[PDB]
Amino acid sequence: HMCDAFVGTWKLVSSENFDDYMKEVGVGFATRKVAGMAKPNMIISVNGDVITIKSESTFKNTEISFILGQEFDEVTADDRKVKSTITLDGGVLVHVQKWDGKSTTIKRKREDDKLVVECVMKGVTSTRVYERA
Numbered sequence: 001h002m003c004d005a006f007v008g009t010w011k012l013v014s015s016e017n018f019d020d021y022m023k024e025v026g027v028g029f030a031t032r033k034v035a036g037m038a039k040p041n042m043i044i045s046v047n048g049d050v051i052t053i054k055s056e057s058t059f060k061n062t063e064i065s066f067i068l069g070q071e072f073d074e075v076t077a078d079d080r081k082v083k084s085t086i087t088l089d090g091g092v093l094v095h096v097q098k099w100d101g102k103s104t105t106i107k108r109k110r111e112d113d114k115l116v117v118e119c120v121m122k123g124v125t126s127t128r129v130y131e132r133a
């Protein structure tokens with residue numbers, strides 16, 4: 001029942017500083033513009049030890065399935081091929097992505113009725129707020 005509070009169907013309702021975050025990641029102009037429009041839905045489910053996060057948008061659909069603490073390969077919406085490890089730290093899902101000698105951390109937490117996603121690349125944070133769909 002670990003991530004039970006994350007389970008469900010979520011829709012992006014607000015974003016802050018996402019363009020700057022993408023710039024810091026290395027996303028190019030066209031992908032930044034198109035990705036920045038999107039209002040993804042995220043579907044989170046758990047089956048035994050396997051957590052699945054599916055994201056659907058006009059731009060791209062993504063999907064990751066993983067076991068906490070166990071590194072896996074991930075294709076991001078901006079098409080990076082990364083090595084990802086996701087843990088739980090005090091009720092927060094902590095997701096580290098490594099590629100090309102770079103690293104970014106995405107933290108997901110429940111706050112009131114929202115699922116708040118903080119994406120950090122060096123000194124730059126973007127906050128992406130989801131509500132139940």
Ligand SMILES: Clc1ccc(Oc2ccccc2-c2nn[nH]n2)c(Cl)c1
Binds near residue numbers: 035056128
């Ligand atoms: Cl399908 C889909 C999935 C994620 C997306 O946005 C991102 C793109 C790059 C890095 C982080 C995020 C993000 N947004 N909320 N959580 N992570 C988009 Cl635009 C579309």
